[PDB]
Amino acid sequence: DQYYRAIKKIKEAAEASNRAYLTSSKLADMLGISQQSASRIIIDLEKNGYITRTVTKRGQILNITEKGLDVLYTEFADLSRILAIKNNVVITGTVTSQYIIQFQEKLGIIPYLNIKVDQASLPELRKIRGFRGIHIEGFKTRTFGSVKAFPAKIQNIPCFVIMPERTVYTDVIEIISDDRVSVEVYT
C-alpha cells in the first residue's frame, strides 16, 4: 500500500514511459513522507524487483519493472472485479513452435498451443495477468503451483489461456482447448 502508492506515483511520474527521474527527496514530497521513509521504500522496491534504480550524469532514474507494473494491473483488475466493471481483452501475436482432471471438471472440456504476443499487445497481456481467472489448484507430489485459466476465443472457437498463478513475465502464452493470430480473452 505505501508500497502500492510509491509504485503508482513512480509510474505516474514516468508518464507515458516506465522511467522517471526521481530522488528519494522528490518521491518523499510526492508521497507526503520523510526523505528517510522514501529512501527505505526505494531500496525495498529495488531489492524485491518492483523497480530498478539507475544513477546517471543526469540524475537518478527509477524504472518500473514488469513486476512493478503487475502490482498496478492487479489493483486495476481487483477494482474491476469488485465494482463489476467489464474489461475483456484482445491480444494478437504469432503462433510459435491432477491438472488434467481439474481442466475436465472446472472447464468442462477434454484437454488436448503456444503464441508469441506482439509488443503492441503487451499492455493487454499485462492487464490479463492482473485478473484471477478460473482457479486451478496446485498440489504436493515437490509442490506444484496453482494455475489461472481464462476463457478465450480464437476465430470464435473457445479455448483457455493457461498461466501460473505465480506470474511469470514472458511474451509467450499457452492455450488449451477441447501464422498471425487474434485472441479475445475474458476476464
Place this chain on the structure above:
Amino acid sequence: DQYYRAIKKIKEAAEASNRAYLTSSKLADMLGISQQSASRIIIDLEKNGYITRTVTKRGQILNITEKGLDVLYTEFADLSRILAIKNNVVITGTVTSQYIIQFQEKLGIIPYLNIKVDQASLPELRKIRGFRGIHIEGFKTRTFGSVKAFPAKIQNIPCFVIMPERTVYTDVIEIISDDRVSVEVYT
C-alpha cells in the same frame, strides 16, 4: 490507503451489494491488523461519511456510502489514466426541468440542459465521477470550486458534462453545449 484498503475489503465482502456483516475483529483479520486498529478505522470511516454502521439483532452491518464508493471509483479511474486503459461510458436517463471564459478557452465553445440518470446507469455515473475530466479553475470573489468537464455526445452531437470537483452525489447531471436520453461520456 489503510483506509482505501478497509473500504475496498468492505465492498469486497459486500459482494454484489453495498452492505456487509462485519465486526471490527473480522475486518481486522481480513486486513492483517489488530482489532483496535480496525475499531479505530471503522469509527473514522463512519464519522467521515465513507461507510455507515448499523447494529441489528443479526449483527453489525457496515454499509459503503456513495462517498465510500467514490474512493474506489477514483482509484479505478487513476489506474485507467496511469495505465492508459480506455473506459468511456454510456449513461441513459430522462430530461428534466469567469467560468464562461474558461469554457470558451479550454473547450473552444460558446456556452448557451439537465438529465436525471436512470438507477441502472448509476454505476456508470459513479465511474465518470472518479475521473478528472477537463479542469476548469475555481476562484475567489466567496471561493468558488473548480469544475470538471467531460466531452460527451448526445445523438452524436458533442457537448460536455459539467460537475463540481468536490463531488456531489446526485442522479442529476448538467450538460453544456455550443424525453429519454443516451449520453456517451469520454473519460
